């Protein structure tokens, strides 16, 4: 039986730009997660009505970008699902775990990339991004940006800016 429990119950979750992948050997399907879909804010499947569990944190307003065919900073530069995705996307609000007073800066997202990610590609590099015409030479300025940014989650944020834990099951 598939060890999905370890995936959902993990104490720590990755930043989306450094999204975590867990390979799960061929297993007896454990449907209890589906029957407990009420535990989650969203539970959607694609290509269903080789198992990977990918997981990470994003903000509430980005949950809709975790789906095939989406656009935006997350789908384009952080975590991209293919058009022929077969699997499920599950997410829940984690404000209780992942915000802190004065801001939790540990979760990051990539702002900029010279081209979009391919589906299931990851990029964790931190080269200073050249937004204008002069080379950056590793130095920040108004044309030269560190390519990641912190969410800064605070418990008092509105729900669209609260942290969400996401699990993507590909099978």
């Amino acid at each position, epitope marked *: 039986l598939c060890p999905f429990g370890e995936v959902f119950n993990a104490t720590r979750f990755a930043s989306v730009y450094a999204w975590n992948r867990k390979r799960i050997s061929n297993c007896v399907a454990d449907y209890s997660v589906l029957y407990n879909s009420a535990s989650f804010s969203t539970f959607k499947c694609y290509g269903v009505s080789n198992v990977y569990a990918d997981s990470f944190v994003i903000r509430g307003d980005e949950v809709r970008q975790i789906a095939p065919g989406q656009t935006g900073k997350i789908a384009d530069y952080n975590y991209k699902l293919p058009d022929d995705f077969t699997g499920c996307v599950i997410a829940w609000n984690s404000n209780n775990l992942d915000s802190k007073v004065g801001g939790n800066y*540990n979760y990051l997202y990539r702002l900029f990339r010279k081209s979009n990610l391919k589906p299931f590609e990851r990029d964790i590099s931190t080269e200073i991004y050249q937004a204008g015409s002069t080379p950056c030479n590793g130095v920040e300025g108004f044309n030269c940006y560190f390519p*990641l940014q912190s969410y800064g989650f*605070q418990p008092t944020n509105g729900v669209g800016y609260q942290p969400y834990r996401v699990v993507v099951l590909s099978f």
Partner: nanobody
Amino acid sequence: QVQLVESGGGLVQPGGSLRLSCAASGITLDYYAIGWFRQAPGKEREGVSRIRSSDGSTNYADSVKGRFTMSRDNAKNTVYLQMNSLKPEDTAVYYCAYGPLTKYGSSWYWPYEYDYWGQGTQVTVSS
């Protein structure tokens, strides 16, 4: 929550001065940047200056270095832009903006995106 309100814009002759204020309420992040930006019709928005709550350093756009100075009031949540030697090309709506710094390991980095923008104050430099 967060409110940013700019004031102090106006009409001045070339070579003149103005001081803009940005009154902020609701600042609860520990590690943040405040920026002054400007936007004119038909031009791209431009960063003008920025300051941060980690090391207090300030950066200025090349076009304004040595003419503009950004600072923090020591007794209230207001930041200023002192603009000296104004030029017609400085004409724009000036905005202040606030958002978190980027923590990467033990280092802090400047953001590109800011969470909150004010409503702008108009600066017009004209004969």
